[PDB]
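pls ignore typos typing on phone
tryptophanyl-5'AMP + seq
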Amino acid sequence: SLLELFNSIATQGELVRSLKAGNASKDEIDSAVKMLVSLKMSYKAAAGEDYKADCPPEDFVDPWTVQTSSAKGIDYDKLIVRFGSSKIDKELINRIERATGQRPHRFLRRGIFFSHRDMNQVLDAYENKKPFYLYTGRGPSSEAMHVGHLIPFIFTKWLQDVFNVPLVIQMTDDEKYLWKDLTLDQAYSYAVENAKDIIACGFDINKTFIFSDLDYMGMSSGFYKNVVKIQKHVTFNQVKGIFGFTDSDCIGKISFPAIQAAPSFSNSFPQIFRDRTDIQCLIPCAIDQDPYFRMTRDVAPRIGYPKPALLHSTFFPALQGAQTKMSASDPNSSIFLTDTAKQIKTKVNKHAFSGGRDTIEEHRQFGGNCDVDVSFMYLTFFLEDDDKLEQIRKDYTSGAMLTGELKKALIEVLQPLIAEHQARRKEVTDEIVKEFMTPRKLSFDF
Amino acid sequence: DFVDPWTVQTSSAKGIDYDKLIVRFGSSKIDKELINRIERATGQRPHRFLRRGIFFSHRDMNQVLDAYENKKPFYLYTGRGPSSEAMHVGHLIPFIFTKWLQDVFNVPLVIQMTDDEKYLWKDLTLDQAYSYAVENAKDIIACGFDINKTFIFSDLDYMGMSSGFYKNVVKIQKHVTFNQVKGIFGFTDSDCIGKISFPAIQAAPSFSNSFPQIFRDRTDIQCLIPCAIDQDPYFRMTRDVAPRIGYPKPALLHSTFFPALQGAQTKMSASDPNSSIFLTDTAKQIKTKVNKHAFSGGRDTIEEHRQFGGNCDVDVSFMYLTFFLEDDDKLEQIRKDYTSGAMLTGELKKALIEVLQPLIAEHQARRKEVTDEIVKEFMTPRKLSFDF
Ligand SMILES: Nc1ncnc2c1ncn2[C@@H]1O[C@H](COP(=O)(O)OC(=O)[C@@H](N)Cc2c[nH]c3ccccc23)[C@@H](O)[C@H]1O
Ligand SMILES: Nc1ncnc2c1ncn2[C@@H]1O[C@H](COP(=O)(O)OC(=O)[C@@H](N)Cc2c[nH]c3ccccc23)[C@@H](O)[C@H]1O
Ligand SMILES: [Mg+2]
Ligand SMILES: [Mg+2]
Ligand SMILES: [Mg+2]
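k done
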């Protein structure tokens, strides 16, 4: 009865947490909160103490949705053909190894970063001592990013280290203002807090410019000019086809794709690239962002600029299964970078979908299915040793390793990952975030 | 019959029915009581445009005067789409009036040069559109605006030099749907996304915290927008969105159109060179355009002119005199004599030429004194001679 009241508060609290992360209105959030407050006040009177969460007593891929009915997840090979991108083959990976002299990142080795556009052109430029730069971004939809968001940022940090190039990181607080029910100050504050998470991945302050759109649009001699250029060469019909917008949407949403396109061109950042328009751009992202840059690549030559190159990642799946991606707006979907060791353990054991059989004795006989097991999927992203991953795959598949064992292994990887990130995030002072976010000349001459 | 920012058209030779237009647009007619209130507030004789019903319609001008009489601040906002260096005397109508408003009320002024607009609509580069904004700014400065109280700005330049302007553009963009701009401006889904979002950029200068070096974080300062009535749809949209984003509605003063040379059925516009008397025209070119091309309301043949009489309601040369002939009594005498048949078109047109020649010549002389340093200073974000 009192335990049943506790669980109802935990369920409703998680629902309230998910609503704040998604595109719900403040009035919808307030209504959910009023239920939560009502249950907690009933618990306080019944239990004689406050509630604390610790103590019981056809595949669709676009920027906003990843959905499939398959338990195995998105058919990434079919997605390449549909989007018209190029498969990252062994020959391209070997070329990156030759050019950098570094072991290919595990995401490349395991086909996590699996698709590209014009990556050979980036390597042509690099091998001929011509400059290029990295561009990625974050829509600061709430405070606290999740482990899924580490996939593009870890890879971008690796690319920056091995190629030694400047990086621009777009914080689209204007996007989030347009799509969510937020004030401008709330959207900007989420961008600053999310920048601290991004900085905690270990990007070099001498080589990295992280910018708020709301701030940078008002202080740049090139950025708005490029936005206007891009806006002339994209129609509403085109963005309706690409992004699924309708005439009931606000004009800000309709025009926003040009703002995400604009950082692809070097003269958007005149203080970094000495007013030059010919610096190759490379854009690491998960493949859901590709519609923005398919559009950007079509526009590029019409305004006299080179097309940006792409590197596309797979999706870090939701805890409930590979049917959806990990998303802050879905209940019990995410492992956040603010989660404690307890909460990481709890989420993996309670919520991570198992491909193992229902009983232990059945598991010994028939074995597990790694193609649907979420815990094994997470190990493909974060277990560093390739031989250990394969050993775990074989043993789980044969039945020699149980679900409990597989989850213990994962928890021992995710706990230090998130803890070390938190340790680095605490070192990020207000002075450091400001410096990362101040328009300035980076340590590169052009 | 049809009036929007891109076209003014009517089958009538008398021109636009301005009284019916007030009713359709939902604006307010300027009456003598309002003109008297402006006189008492300023302590100056009302401008000939007000006296003769050229500036004829308004929105919330009583609220502007309420604020002004109670010693509250207001500011002026107008603009120019720099399509080319080729401006004409019809463009002087809003800027001459705005300059008078600045003097008599003693208020700050912002002038928007929409080079981004003309890039989006016309076959121009960014630098070409910007260059026209600079050249047009010299023509605007030549009307005599006070450098200590006037901020002229390129959208392309100023968007990147403002902690306030883009933030307001985004606020407006969030609260205006595509269905609304389709309904207001007649845009279609084949239009570029820049055209669809542009009305937010023309809306943004209506709100004072767009200009932080002039007004800081103040969101309460009354705005007043002089224009010809073709711009009204932009500010119908602005007035509707304002309360939805916690800002006051901008007030308006609407002018009539300086008609085309060939007739009042169309307004004077640079897009058709034959309709326009340009500000770059010489004395000789002003004679030729008035004599040969300015439509006559008089009868063909001299005998019929004295028998039947002239028609001031369709005569373009008389219409131009109502805008620029300074004496009211002489205008009425010319109206009487032309209507009765005493004055012929030739005599009417000759009197018009004697007003337009020194009008344009003096403007050309004042424009020549506008240096590169003055236009630069006008266009630099800075604090004006006002405290808030
Ligand atoms: N479950 C997941 N697994 C793997 N990757 C994921 C997962 N969820 C999100 N991502 C990727 O993380 C980045 C940020 O996502 P956003 O939705 O904030 O992303 C956004 O809202 C953009 N509008 C911000 C942006 C601006 N410019 C860019 C350039 C590249 C990438 C992103 C941007 C993205 O790379 C996204 O693909
Ligand atoms: N034949 C005529 N007779 C009398 N007045 C006329 C005639 N033709 C034009 N006007 C007025 O001149 C100003 C500039 O016109 P634009 O078409 O450049 O105007 C434009 O292209 C705007 N998008 C620029 C703008 C931005 N903000 C503003 C605020 C007020 C007025 C104008 C603006 C206008 O006042 C216009 O009403
Ligand atoms: Mg997001
Ligand atoms: Mg998103
Ligand atoms: Mg006009």
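Residues 1-257 of chain B form a domain with the Rossmann fold fold (CATH 3.40.50.620). The longest strand of chain B covers residues 74-80. more later
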